[PDB]
Write a protein that binds this ligand. Structure first.
Ligand SMILES: FC(F)(F)c1ccc(-c2onc3ccc(-c4nnn[nH]4)cc23)cc1
Length: 237
């Protein structure tokens, strides 16, 4: 992800088939002639899409130009959470399924995985960051405290941002409870709150494994529900 001062990010297409799949997802949802009620509502929860972009002198080099969801913040606190019980898709080989489950074997049980976070600490005017090994090290016993960390600014727990996050997720959940045409594997929620403010973003990202479906995305729903439950518990801290 390249942050551009114009308030967008450039995301390089991942190798095939993942990159091409994510391109077609954005093209389907943001089709200018789309009047599918499900897809028009879905746009509310995604980064705005500005189309495919490539460097003037390098048409081979494909990017997605997306809204930078962090742009309007002064000191954005950012957390990426992968949602679902399965981070492998319906076309995964036994090898790939094993590869994916082993990356985080607790995915089925918890329904979400923290990919990383960047948290502003007020007292030091500095950031603390966690990488993929943080979330992959969390268990049922430690997930509540693991998520809580995102919302602690060194001084206090930001229950305002926690409650706001629940309210934003509930709208995404409602979208999922009212559609049976897409299932999302290995996709994420991007959480942003103001570290230096009640303003909160929660947006769906990373669509390299979104597939047409005839059923509720039950894995995604389980994950959202569990994540909401954890956030709800944190409000009692
Ligand atoms: F923490 C960082 F590194 F500073 C960071 C991470 C993600 C973003 C970010 O802001 N808007 C996005 C929109 C989409 C994505 C994205 N899509 N797929 N993978 N990441 C990422 C986005 C911005 C900053």
């Amino acid at each position: 992800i390249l942050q551009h001062p114009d308030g967008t990010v450039l995301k390089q297409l991942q190798p095939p088939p993942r990159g091409p799949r994510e391109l077609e997802f954005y093209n389907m949802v943001y089709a200018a002639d789309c009047f599918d009620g499900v897809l028009l509502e879905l746009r509310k929860y995604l980064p705005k899409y500005y189309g495919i972009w490539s460097p003037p002198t390098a048409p081979n080099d494909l990017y997605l130009k997306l809204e930078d969801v962090t742009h309007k913040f002064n000191k954005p606190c950012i957390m990426d959470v992968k949602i679902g019980q399965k981070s492998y898709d319906p076309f995964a080989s036994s090898e790939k399924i094993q590869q994916q489950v082993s990356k985080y074997p607790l995915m089925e049980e918890i329904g979400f995985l923290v990919l990383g976070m960047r948290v502003y600490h007020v007292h030091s005017d500095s950031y603390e960051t966690e990488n993929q090994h943080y979330g992959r090290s969390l268990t049922k016993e430690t997930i509540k405290d693991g998520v809580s960390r995102f919302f602690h600014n060194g001084y206090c727990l930001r229950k305002d941002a926690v409650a706001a996050s629940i309210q934003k997720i509930e709208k995404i959940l409602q979208w999922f409870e009212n559609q049976k045409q897409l299932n999302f594997y290995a996709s994420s929620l991007l959480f942003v709150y103001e570290g230096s403010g009640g303003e909160v973003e929660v947006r769906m990202i990373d669509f390299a494994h979104v597939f047409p479906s005839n059923t509720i995305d039950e894995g995604y729903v389980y994950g959202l529900k569990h994540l909401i439950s954890v956030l709800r518990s944190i409000l009692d801290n």
